[PDB]
Ligand binder design. Structure first.
Ligand SMILES: CCOC(=O)c1cncn1[C@H](C)c1ccccc1
Ligand SMILES: C[N+](C)(C)CCO
Lengths: 426, 387, 412, 409, 388
């Protein structure tokens, strides 16, 4: 017969096991729950929802003196599997979850050794709340944490801790999320930079209650920005430069305003999409958002100035006067500064000829004035180009270089010199 | 049946569903696991999740549930609720959104020799890495990892029912084609538990997308709007519609690029070839708009302020035009006398200025013809290379 | 006190819920199905799922729950919660979500002879592969497949309900409890028992009961709100052949505007149909065709503009081109000396300018002729396409018989 | 633990968790209700629903769970699963979905005196009426109403939770700085708690927690308001363009379409309630109507500018108003103004007459164009003034909206 | 309480929750059903589903649960879990998306005479036949049908508490107004079962939509573009912008039609009045584009190739312009030199002839434009008067 049945009946039935009582000899004693986390897949991070969905294996380990047996009395049974609804397990809960899933949904068996060491390694899909810092999107790095607390007992009754490991006879705590190099699936969008784990204590509270301790697993991740750079920033930048290029069209083309307005509307569309892709927080304006606002304002200036140029180009001596001051400003000085290129029948006949000559001379003078106004308009729009396009290019370069010079700080916990890396335990 | 009722009461009277079904604790339970794909509900490319409707066929022998048919009216088989007997805990490792294990506890078929057959339904929402290089002519390869969670290989062993899963009752997708499917058994060593081996079986499905929805709704409009790129150079500058047409083409192209972007995951692993084509087309279109603005500015160059330099007259007016063949290009009376002479002189000056202006217009025309020829060369070499 | 108490206490005492009520070893339970439809909630084309509010009626015989009426004061019928009784695990096999069982586990009516009568209500979301070839004039052929989830054909024998000795081979629709959908009309509603001959009498999937719903869309809404505007807007391209070919004519503006409108309408249609790739919707083919035609019209407008604005300086009008395009094709449809010199110069210059203008006018006329010819061609193409689509759509009629082979009507 | 198990077996031998603890018939059970807010997750304005992650601090007394610590080796208190003892069915009455009860069932803490403490956790969706008058410069007043679904005032008396020291009552939501996550779109201004009764229903009583929260509108400013300001600038600009440019309709129509698109997109973020019109929507409608009138007046100006004596005759009132009176006020005054020989003389005379007629015709055409220019300038000034005043007034009114210093609750 | 503990132990010791609470099996259980509407959560017009927040008050007598107060210290009321006693399987017949019956099994009040009162909560997602013909000024009437699923009128009888459902604690919607609400009890006689009555209670609420939101957010833009419709006829053809304005108006109206359709069910039972108005406007905008293309073609007609027919001149230059009152319409070498001057004069004469012909064509085009403008204004006036 299977000796396992006899052993389990002896442990749980004959000895009157109570799964609602802490596993300690004495009431004042404490239970140490070792904890560790294994990340098997970083499913997603919805910035709109400010949620981090992660597929993890949450390891627990404690001692139950009531589940101890002598392996010799029974057959050499060195390990045993029991369902968690038969033994006492600690209900560690994820406090910062978005949905109502406070703890694992699949309750797998627990492994019990003859010395009482109980181990429990259930899988879980956790949806935790991660505030998003959109200051440098899409060159941003996020800092999401999973905060685990024990609410069924207070710090005087069970003590959370970090799982210890041995390499050369000395126990060193595991201050990191465990990533198996082969059972891990690298995420396409995010790459893990730091993954410390820390046991926090809050001295302003008391061990009376359940807000005195927790174990928090942090996860600092950087976004791979190639997708957004290729698909969102390059088209926007090129379309933006088209606006500055709109200064070079002659006023007789009949398409200056159309070009500038098309650029502005494209910028607005890109701004709306950027809005759609981010949370509605007010902590800061995203980098791409700042660039879009700046470029839209600049293109509005371009439109207004093209309008002024057009109004100048279509003036005639019939409505305006070309004063000497404007003439010398926009036809002598600025063009050089900006390097711009450069018998009765006989009497009737004679009177008619004189009148024709006078009319033609008047028409020529009118056309001369019209040409002068044309030149004034060209000077204005050349000055506008030289004043605006450099600002456009400098602003674009500055914005998209400042964002690219934004790296995670190479060490979590600014005031801490420890690396919290798997390769160099403390 | 009185006989069946008595039998079932006898079997489970002293049965402990917590213990493994083995005569001796050192033996191991052999479980033949076989997957049956009933439907492919969806493949969410953006979220990289594949939702399938399967049945997880499992078999094993429970020596505690054997009976002699002679004592029970010759009953050879019975059906028992899955919650009354020991079951193996199979877990889908790469779960993404759904449940890790089986949640529909259906009944199982128990043979008189102890053999058990259990085929519970499931909805596996498993993680799927999406390669978008050839979207929408892409093929997807993503898997389902199944294994025993709490028992190692020396306690419960799983082996596949057959080399491939069962698609006999598979419902035709209408959006994917099952190119291939295979199941492989692995022995793995996890850092948790380095002493003993953990088994698992991985089923994978090579899925080929049927490219008709996206060809009709995405690619054909993309190509149609791309093929308008060249028309800019054939439009005369006097029409006052070059910028309108070119800007419309550019904006349509970028809108289509955005639409394509909404259909693929944000991963940076690789860039779609269709998206890369669209980006190349946009870059060429923007270069075309730059050169078009240069052409327009040249066509309206007033001779008063601009004198055509020799280096452009020699090249654009004497060299290229001959090179290209396909085109078809090339008191009172005293005052009255003074006024007539003035009129004649002014007409001569106006004729000179008009000749200069027409020379500038000719330069613009040759420039845009050169660009049209370059565009045709690119189109021809591209259409030859793609074929 | 209520006599039903001791009756039910005797029945359910010593009664195993897990044992199939087979009298002997070869006995087979006849499970009887009848489907009643009360509301066809929706048909999610994108999700390819049909949602229905049905009452499924299931009947079997359990010899264990039989009494002798005279013993219990003539009680011939009791109600027992279904969780206390054996049930045939009849489930909807082709559901989209994981919901196999019924929504509400009602009570089971039990008669003194053992008869069991269970009528649970359910909201069923079932798969229905949708054919888009004729949208929005399409008709869909959706089915509800019911089979036992546990027992095979050697234990349970699924059958259709027999009423008054005549089999009920249709979905029952009660005029009292039925709300006509408004978007879909039910034309046929047959039911039949189906066998999967690839499997033996074991395997639990051998036998099925399939209830069919052949529903026809009412197309007025889509005609008014999508098709009619699309066609009316698409017909505007042909107008570009009457606008002047010069600055301010706006040929390209109108052409490109109509092209973009057609693209937007294509996207809209895309949002209204499933992403399956088995067929292209008819309206989608129409939209692609008119997009291609209007792209051709854009090219033709560009060509006409290029021809009309030509000048003698750049392009020289030959005799072949002049003869062709202005011939047959239109058919088918001291001080004194100085003063004298100045006057001569003036006359000469004016004459030269006038001749140049005349040549420009000749080019303009050639352009107009090309415009007229291409207009007729384009109108022909557009009319042919629109008429073809109209004919194909209006001639799609739902089949006369539920199953084309059979001659039966499958109605009450 | 042997002694704790013995104590548990003694306590629950005959204890019925379905019976309210009342030593004597007619006794009431005092229940203290507190709330701790750990994270104000969402405030969905479309569905008028607030999602919060909270602890529900409850406490009462059960005379049946009493023991002498000396008899059990000094066990002062126990942690007992909540399903084993009687608890009041305290639920969120104004939830939006059907979830009344709590989510996480933590153990209760029973002290030897009979005092039960239970601090469950839940993710609640509470329905919150939203006032949209000043969206997005608005402050909301969202409540969570807790009471016993089952027991009324003749059975349980609700009170306020005591502070950590257990000296005074706490009349407000508790926030633990070590476990609170700032929302980032809302700032909590007030958070009082108050007991409420109904005059007509003596058997009603609940404890309500209020959350006066002020939106931080930077997002809506940046992504909706400034773009519309630029569009309005373009709409005003349309009146400075000359009618000869041929781009007046392009500009005006583009502005109109852009502002309409902004309104359509913004319609997705405001509640569909009809009690008032949000300030943002009022501003957008004002700009849309202004731009539509801009289109109409631009069409009028274009019509005026393209008139000639061959088609129209200038009426006296138009000349009086637009040629003489307005321009001085608008600072737009225009500047002040032998057979063969016989045949040749006839030809020259004809040419002269032709030129004279052309000059007169051109003068009248120029008069019409001047009327158009003057009207366009008048419209420019009027529209600039109206747009500036309207925008400034609307946003000034929006800016003077802050939650009251006194929550009134 | 010790007394209450003893009482509850005695009540349920030999109580079967599977049996109807009747002294004799021939009687029926009188159940008093009353619906209390707490909140109207939503009305999904696209899916035709109405979500409501209700409490389903039910009362009945269970003689098996009676006791004498003097024996238990004077206790006259207790609270029992509803999972411990017989309950009526009351089901919502026209459920559309939610649960058919009650799922939140709260406790119930129980008097010493057996009188029970159970007031469980529920979210009823019922089916609403939405009639969009006056949207957004529409009135919706849709109901909630309740009844005992498995018992006929001779075993379990349901009666309403009052003629109307209880809205004392109703939460004002801010999007609909409760015009009326009633509850009616129906005796049905199905065909399955033609000998016994099948009871049913149907509550209905007449909801009146508050239209301010949809007015401001949909109708005002639609009306504004509709009023821009006829503006093209006042735009001169020399501007070269008529196609821009016409096409912009057409596309704006199309966008607004597409916005409206996504706000109503796809049913073809009736066509909304607003959509009908929008389509009428679209048809007239298409007519405007065609006729304005005709006008543009007329305006640029070349005088050389085309000669104005006499009827055109009479109609559009001699008669119609007078009709309009409010308009401002109008109604050796020396020999060569001499020959050159003569040539100049002759060419000016010919050019003047051609230009006069062209100006006549332009006048005709303007007159056509103005006729169409006045016709559209007539339609505007007649529609405003008749509809408003
Ligand atoms: C009853 C229909 O009335 C209208 O359509 C109506 C009334 N005032 C204005 N309109 C619209 C703009 C209209 C005017 C001219 C033609 C078509 C549509
Ligand atoms: C097999 N795993 C290592 C994943 C779990 C052991 O409990």
């Amino acid at each position: 017969v299977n000796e396992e049945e006899r052993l389990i009946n002896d442990l749980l039935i004959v000895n009157k096991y109570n799964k609602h009582v802490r596993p300690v000899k004495h009431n004042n004693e404490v239970v140490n729950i070792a904890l560790s986390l294994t990340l098997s897949n970083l499913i997603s991070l919805k910035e709109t929802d400010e949620t981090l969905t992660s597929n993890v294996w949450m390891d627990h380990a404690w001692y139950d003196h009531r589940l101890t047996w002598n392996a010799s009395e029974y057959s050499d049974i060195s390990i045993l599997r029991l369902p968690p609804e038969l033994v006492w397990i600690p209900d560690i809960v994820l406090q910062n979850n978005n949905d109502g899933q406070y703890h694992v949904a699949y309750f797998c068996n627990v492994l019990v050794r003859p010395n009482g060491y109980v181990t429990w390694l259930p899988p879980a899909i956790f949806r935790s709340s991660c505030p998003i810092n959109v200051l440098y999107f899409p060159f941003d790095w996020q800092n999401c944490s999973l905060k685990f607390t024990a609410l069924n007992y207070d710090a005087n009754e069970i003590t959370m801790d970090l799982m210890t490991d041995t390499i050369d006879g000395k126990d060193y705590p595991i201050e990191w999320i465990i990533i198996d190099p082969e059972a891990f699936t690298e995420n396409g969008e995010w790459e893990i930079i730091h993954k410390p784990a820390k046991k926090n204590i809050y001295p302003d509270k008391f061990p009376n209650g359940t807000n005195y301790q927790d174990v928090t697993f942090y996860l600092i991740i950087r976004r791979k920005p190639l997708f957004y750079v290729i698909n969102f920033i390059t088209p926007c930048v090129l379309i933006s430069f088209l606006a500055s290029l709109a200064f070079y069209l002659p006023a007789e083309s009949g398409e200056k305003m159309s070009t500038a307005i098309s650029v502005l509307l494209a910028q607005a569309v890109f701004l709306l999409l950027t809005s759609q892709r981010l949370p509605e927080t007010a902590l800061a304006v995203p980098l791409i958002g700042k660039y879009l606002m700046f470029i839209m304002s600049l293109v509005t200036g371009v439109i207004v100035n093209c309008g002024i140029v057009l109004n100048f180009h279509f003036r005639t001596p019939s409505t305006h006067v070309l004063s000497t001051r404007v003439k010398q400003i926009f036809l002598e000085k600025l063009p050089r500064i900006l390097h711009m290129s450069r018998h009765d029948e006989i009497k009737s006949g004679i009177d008619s000829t004189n009148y024709i000559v006078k009319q033609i001379k008047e028409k020529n003078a009118y056309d001369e004035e019209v040409g002068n106004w044309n030149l004034v308009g060209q000077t204005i729009d050349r000055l506008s180009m030289f004043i605006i396009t450099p600002v456009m290019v400098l602003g674009t370069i500055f914005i998209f270089v400042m964002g690219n010079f934004n790296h995670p700080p190479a060490k979590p916990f600014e005031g801490d010199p420890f690396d919290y890396s798997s390769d160099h335990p403390r | 049946s009185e006989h069946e009722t008595r039998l079932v009461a006898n079997l489970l009277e002293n049965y402990n569903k917590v213990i493994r079904p083995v005569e001796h604790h050192t033996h191991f339970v052999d479980i033949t696991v076989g997957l049956q794909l009933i439907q492919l509900i969806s493949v969410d490319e953006v979220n990289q999740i594949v939702e399938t409707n399967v049945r997880l066929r499992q078999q094993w022998i429970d020596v505690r549930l054997r009976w002699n048919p002679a004592d029970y009216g010759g009953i050879k088989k019975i059906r028992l609720p899955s919650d009354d007997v020991w079951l193996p805990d199979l877990v889908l490792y790469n779960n993404a959104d759904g449940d890790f294990a089986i949640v529909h506890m259906t009944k199982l078929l128990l043979d008189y020799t102890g053999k058990i057959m259990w085929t519970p339904p499931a909805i596996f929402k498993s993680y799927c890495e999406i390669i978008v290089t050839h979207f929408p002519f892409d093929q997807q390869n993503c898997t389902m990892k199944l294994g025993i969670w709490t028992y190692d290989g020396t306690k419960v062993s799983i082996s596949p029912e057959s080399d491939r899963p069962d698609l006999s009752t598979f419902m035709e997708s209408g959006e994917w084609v099952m190119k291939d499917y295979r199941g492989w058994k692995h022995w793995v060593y996890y850092t948790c538990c380095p002493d003993t081996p953990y088994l698992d079986i991985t089923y994978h499905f090579i899925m080929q997308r049927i490219p008709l929805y996206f060809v009709v709704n995405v690619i054909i409009p993309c190509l149609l709007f791309s093929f308008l790129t060249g028309l800019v150079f054939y439009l005369p500058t006097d029409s006052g519609e070059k910028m309108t047409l070119s800007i419309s083409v550019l904006l349509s192209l970028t809108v289509f690029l955005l639409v394509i972007v909404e259909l693929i995951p944000s991963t940076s692993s690789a860039v779609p070839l269709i998206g890369k084509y669209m980006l190349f087309t946009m870059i060429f279109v923007i270069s075309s708009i730059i050169i078009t603005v240069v052409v327009i500015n040249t066509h309206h160059r007033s001779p008063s302020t601009h004198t055509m330099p020799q280096w452009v007259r020699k090249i654009f007016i004497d060299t290229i035009p001959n090179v290209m063949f396909f085109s078809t290009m090339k008191p009172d009376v005293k005052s009255a006398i003074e006024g007539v002479k003035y009129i004649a002189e002014h007409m001569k000056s106006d004729e000179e200025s008009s000749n200069a202006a027409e020379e500038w217009k000719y330069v613009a025309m040759v420039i845009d013809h050169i660009l049209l020829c370059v565009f045709m060369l690119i189109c021809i070499i591209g259409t030859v290379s793609v074929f | 006190e209520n006599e039903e108490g001791r009756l039910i206490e005797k029945l359910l005492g010593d009664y195993d819920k897990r044992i199939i009520p087979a009298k002997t070893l070869d006995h087979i339970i006849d499970v009887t199905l009848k489907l009643t439809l009360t509301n066809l909630i929706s048909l999610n084309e994108k999700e390819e799922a049909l949602t229905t509010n049905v009452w499924i009626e299931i009947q079997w015989n359990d010899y264990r729950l039989s009494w002798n009426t005279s013993e219990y004061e003539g009680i011939d019928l009791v109600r027992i919660p279904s969780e206390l009784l054996w049930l045939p695990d009849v489930v909807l096999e082709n559901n989209v979500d994981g919901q196999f069982e019924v929504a509400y586990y009602a009570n089971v009516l039990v008669y003194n002879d053992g008869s069991m009568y269970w009528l649970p209500p359910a909201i069923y979301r079932s798969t229905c592969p949708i054919a888009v070839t004729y949208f929005p004039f399409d008709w869909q052929n959706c089915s509800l497949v019911f089979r036992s989830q546990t027992y095979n054909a050697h234990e349970v024998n699924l059958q259709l309900s027999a009423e008054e000795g005549e089999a009920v081979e249709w979905i029952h629709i009660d005029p009292e409890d039925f709300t006509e959908n408004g978007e879909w009309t039910i034309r046929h509603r047959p039911a039949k028992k189906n066998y999967n001959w690839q499997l033996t009498k074991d395997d639990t999937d051998f036998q099925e009961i399939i209830f069919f719903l052949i529903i026809q869309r009412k197309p007025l809404f889509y005609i008014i709100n999508i098709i009619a505007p699309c066609v009316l807007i698409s017909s505007l391209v042909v107008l570009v052949y009457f606008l002047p070919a010069q600055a301010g004519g706006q040929k390209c503006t109108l052409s490109i505007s109509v092209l973009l409108a057609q693209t937007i309408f294509l996207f809209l249609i895309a949002q209204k149909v499933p992403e399956t790739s088995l067929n292209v919707p008819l309206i989608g083919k129409y939209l692609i065709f008119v997009m291609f035609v209007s792209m051709l019209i854009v090219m033709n407008c560009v060509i006409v503009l290029n021809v009309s604005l030509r000048t003698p300086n750049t392009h020289s009008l030959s005799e072949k081109i002049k003869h062709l395009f202005l011939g047959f094709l239109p058919k088918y449809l001291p001080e004194i000396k100085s003063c004298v010199e100045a006057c001569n110069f003036i006359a000469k210059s004016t004459k030269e300018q006038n001749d140049s203008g005349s040549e420009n006018e000749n080019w303009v006329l050639i352009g107009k002729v090309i415009d007229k010819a291409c207009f007729w061609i384009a109108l022909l193409l557009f009319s042919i396409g629109t008429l073809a689509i109209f004919l194909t759509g209006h001639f799609n009629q739902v089949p006369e018989f539920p199953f084309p082979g059979d001659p039966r009507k499958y109605v009450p | 633990s042997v002694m704790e198990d013995t104590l548990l077996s003694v306590l629950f031998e005959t204890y019925n968790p379905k019976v309210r603890p009342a030593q004597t018939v007619g006794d009431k059970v005092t229940v203290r209700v507190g709330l701790t807010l750990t994270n104000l997750l969402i405030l969905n304005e479309k569905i008028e629903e607030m999602t919060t992650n909270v602890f529900l601090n409850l406490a009462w007394t059960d005379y049946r769970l009493q023991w002498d610590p000396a008899a059990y080796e000094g066990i002062k208190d126990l942690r007992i699963p909540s399903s084993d003892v009687w608890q009041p069915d305290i639920v969120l009455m104004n939830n939006n979905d059907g979830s009344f009860e709590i989510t996480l069932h933590v153990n209760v803490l029973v002290q030897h005196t009979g005092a039960v403490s239970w601090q469950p956790s839940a993710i609640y969706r509470s329905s919150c009426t939203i006032k949209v008058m000043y969206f997005p410069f608005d402050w909301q007043n969202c409540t969570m109403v807790f009471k016993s679904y089952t027991y009324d005032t003749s059975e349980v008396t609700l009170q306020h939770a005591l502070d950590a020291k257990g000296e005074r009552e706490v009349k407000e939501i508790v926030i633990n700085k070590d476990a609170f996550t700032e929302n980032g779109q809302w700032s909590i201004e007030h958070k009082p708690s108050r007991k409420n009764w109904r005059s007509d229903d003596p058997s009603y009583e609940d404890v309500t927690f209020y959350l006066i929260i002020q939106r931080k509108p930077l997002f809506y400013i940046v992504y909706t308001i400034i773009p519309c300001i630029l569009i309005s600038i373009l709409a005003i600009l349309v009146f400075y363009l000359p009618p000869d440019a041929g781009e007046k309709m392009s500009l005006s129509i583009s502005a109109l379409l852009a502002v309409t698109v902004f309104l359509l997109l913004l319609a997705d973020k405001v509640p569909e309630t009809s009690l008032s019109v949000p300030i943002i929507i009022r501003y957008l409608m004002f700009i849309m109507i202004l731009v539509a009138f801009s289109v109409i007046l631009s069409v009028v100006v274009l019509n005026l500018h393209h008139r000639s004596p061959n088609t129209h005759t200038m009426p006296n009132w138009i000349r009086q108003i637009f040629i003489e009176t307005l321009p001085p006020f608008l600072w737009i005054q225009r500047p002040v103004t032998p057979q063969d020989l016989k045949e040749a003389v006839e030809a020259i005379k004809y040419i002269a007459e032709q030129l004279e007629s052309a000059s007169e015709f051109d003068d009248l055409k120029k008069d019409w164009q001047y009327v158009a220019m003057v009207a366009d300038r008048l419209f420019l000034y009027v529209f600039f003034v109206i747009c500036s005043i309207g925008t400034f007034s609307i946003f000034l009114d929006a800016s003077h909206n802050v939650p009251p210093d006194n929550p009134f609750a």
